């Protein structure tokens with residue numbers, strides 16, 4: 373609920389398939405600065421269940437190499453918001469998507485201390501999409517980000533964007 377842009381009328385079935393993590397931003401540099409930083413995750417695929425939960429396939433660098441990870445995001449009463457559960461119960465919020473080209477999401481830790489908030493611009497192809505990046509940057513202008521990364525088409529085709 374730090375982020376107050378939410379996709380009205382989200383049809384979670386339609387975000388299925390392959391995505392590319394074109395850009396990332398976080399409120400804390402340490403969340404994204406190294407290959408093995410904790411929210412440096414490269415989205416591969418979204419797999420919505422029939423009950424409306426969301427299976428997530430991603431990569432993450434750990435122990436000197438690019439590892440595949442599977443993650444379950446459970447639905448809530450709000451169609452745009454999901455919970456990772458696991459250790460801290462992180463919420464994931466879909467800000468905006470048009471399903472066939474881009475999707476903007478943010479995630480926050482359900483409490484703090486020092487605020488942890490990270491967002492991504494996903495796109496459907498290995499292409500720099502200026503319009504989506506522009507919407508991403510607009511979405512974030514009033515959020516307190518201190519690190520922003522983006523990736524070139526070559527990196528997007530490589531595991532962990534190396």
Ligand SMILES: CCCCCCCCCCCCCCCCCCC(=O)O
Nearest residue numbers: 410411413426428432441442464466477
């Ligand atoms: C509805 C659109 C939603 C798309 C965006 C997905 C959001 C990704 C959130 C990723 C945070 C989790 C941090 C990485 C944990 C590694 C995994 C450890 C393991 O299970 O072995």
